[PDB]
Paper text:
dArmRPs are currently being developed as modular peptide binders. In these proteins, a varying number of internal repeats, binding the peptide, and capping repeats, which shield the hydrophobic core from the aqueous environment, are stacked together to form a superhelical repeat protein. Designed ankyrin repeat proteins (DARPins) are another class of helical repeat proteins which have been engineered as an alternative binding scaffold. Here we show how we applied rigid shared helix fusions and the well crystallising DARPin D12 to construct a crystallisation scaffold that exhibits ideal peptide binding on a dArmRP binding surface without interfering crystal contacts.
A fusion of the DARPin to H2 of the internal repeat of the dArmRP crystallized readily in space group P21 and diffracted to 1.6 Å with one molecule in the asymmetric unit. A crystal contact was found between the DARPin paratope and the dArmRP binding surface. The first helix of the DARPin (residues 145–148) was unwound and formed a longer loop instead of an α-helix. This was probably caused by both the crystal contact and its resulting forces as well as by an altered interface between the shared helix and the DARPin. Tyr150 pointed towards the interface and made key hydrophobic interactions, thus stabilising the changed interface, instead of lying on top of the interface as in the designed model. On the other hand, the interface between the shared helix and the dArmRP aligned well with the design. Overall, this results in a Cα RMSD of 2.3 Å at the interface between the DARPin and the shared helix (residues 112–168) and in a Cα RMSD of 0.6 Å at the interface between the shared helix and the dArmRP (residues 150–208). Although a target peptide was added in 1.5-fold molar excess prior to crystallisation, it was not visible in the electron density map. This was probably due to the crystal contact between a symmetry-related DARPin and the binding surface of the dArmRP, displacing the peptide.
Numbering used by the authors: 3 to 397
Amino acid sequence: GSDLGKKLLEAARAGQDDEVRILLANGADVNTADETGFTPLHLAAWEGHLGIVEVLLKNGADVNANDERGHTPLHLAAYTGHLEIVEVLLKNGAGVNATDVIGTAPLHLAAMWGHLEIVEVLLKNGAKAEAKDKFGKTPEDLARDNGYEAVARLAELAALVLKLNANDDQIIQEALWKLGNHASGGNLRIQWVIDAGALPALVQLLSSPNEQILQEALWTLGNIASGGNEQIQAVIDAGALPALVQLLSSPNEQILQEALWTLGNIASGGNEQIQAVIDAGALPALVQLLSSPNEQILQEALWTLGNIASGGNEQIQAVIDAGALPALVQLLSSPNEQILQEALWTLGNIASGGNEQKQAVKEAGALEKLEQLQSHENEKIQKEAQEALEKLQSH
Ligand SMILES: [Cl-]
Ligand SMILES: [Cl-]
């Protein structure tokens, strides 16, 4: 008539390893429940008795037993910060997204206390970071900015990067949307995207025939390329330039615009990074796009060329050798005042080179038009024409 169930509950909670073993051998119900539904596994998880947790599971304990609140052993181990028990429970099939009667999941309980190693393990095993409880609170809400956000962000970005390798374009697309959102965050977020390993996957996606994938991938890449020179170098080192140059032949004008914007951002870096753009063969396509009827594409190519021409004399000469000057001089007759200003800036950069570069500018007939625009009634164009003529005339 011994109450083996009661004795087992008490032995499990007290950490009496030998007594648990003996009670189980004598037929105690491993899934005994107390007055509010706690099983021996609940109590051992709460108290942190790893050996007893393992013995109970070996003897068939229900890893997902619910008490009357809906708490599982995983809830209790997460709440109490018992990391090794969390791992053992998950290894034995614990429900990582189980919710109690008010919608609380194990991740909520780990986050609220700052059990950040458990947070990491739960996320690694598929815990949902956006899970909301009865009052709309996510685990992030309950963490109160205790370091949870960095751990969750690391996990969210690495999962998004892995989805870029999926074999469904819709999975790739929705992941690119979220990565694009992160890249939109500017310098305070972009390094997290780089550190998640996104750049190689983004570059590889530039071979996709799916134009929506190309558009979202380029959007993310261009924003990363708007960072510092070390971030530009990561884009280059990921292999972006040959793929970007290929896309300058795209029939899609949005892809064309985004590719030029990304190339212009890269070309806004250091001299070696300008040289990478040249070495990838971008200049022929850039010069051809100066004839584009689309003014946004025209202006984006103009700006990229001006950035390239902000480099050394040999890089300026590469622009000249690609035939840019006749097209640039033509653009000084543009009715559009933005294109006129950007053409003056690019030509001024070219004119800031050496004697050889200055001579090509004069032979292209730029002096006639620079001195004419020196008196232009628009002050901005007047400035650029003045400064450009100065660069041409100095040294
Ligand atoms: Cl533990
Ligand atoms: Cl922890």
